[PDB]
Structure 1
Amino acid sequence: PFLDIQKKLGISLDRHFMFLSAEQPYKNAARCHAFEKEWIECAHGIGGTRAKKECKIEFDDFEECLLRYKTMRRMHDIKKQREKLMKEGKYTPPPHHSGREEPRP
């Protein structure tokens, strides 16, 4: 913040819910809690520029967890290949993907 009155007085008016891995009601972990924790643990103490340069792996893992762009691309490629194989008829779904299976608890 522009003024550090909260840090000078030691209080936390808004500093304890600044991100997903912060304090949560009834210990309900948010999505990508581990990824955001790793990103903050990497980026702490080295500054913004070094955090952008050197914690790129942690930031990319956190971003992939949060937005799931590559997961969507991979699933779309799998489903597109599956429907192409269905169109040319050289593939059939297994029973457990087609609705009839042996359920387990």
Structure 2
Amino acid sequence: PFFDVQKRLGVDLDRWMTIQSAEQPHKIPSRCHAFEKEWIECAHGIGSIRAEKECKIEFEDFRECLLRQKTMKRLHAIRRQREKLIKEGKYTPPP
């Protein structure tokens, strides 16, 4: 915050909703809890300039869990190769 009244007064006005790995009702976890947790812990206290380079691996994994762009790209590749092979009659899906 521009004026960090919350930290200085020790009162939680809105930090409880800022991240998805914080405490949640009935301990319901978010789908990317472990990825966000790992990236936050790597990047804690070193500053965003350092974190952008030194925690790059965690952030890349976390972004993969969030949007699943690589995973979809791999499935789209296997789907392409099947419905192609199926036309050349070279594949038979199992029962």
Offset from partner CA, 1:45-66 (integer Å, 9 cap, x none): 1001001010000000000011
* Higher relative contact order (CA closer than 8 Å, sequence separation 6+): 2
CA distance in 2, matches of 1:70, 1:4: 38
TM-score by length of 1: 0.88
Offset from partner CA, 1:38-88 (integer Å, 9 cap, x none): 000000010010010100000000000110000000000001100000011
Shift of 1:22: 1.3
Shift of 1:23: 1.5
Structure 2: gaps of 5 or more residues? none
Structure 1: gaps of 5 or more residues? 96-105
| Aligned residue runs from structure 1 range 1-105, under 5 A | 1-95=1-95
Q: CA RMSD in A?
A: 0.6
CA distance in 2, matches of 1:82, 1:24: 42
Identity across matched positions, percent: 73
Aligned length, in residue pairs: 95
TM-score by length of 2: 0.97
Structure with the greater alpha carbon radius of gyration: 1
Amino acid across the alignment from 2:64: E
Deviation >3 Å, runs of 4+: none
CA distance in 1, matches of 2:14, 2:37: 18
CA distance in 1, matches of 2:20, 2:4: 23
Amino acid across the alignment from 1:72: M
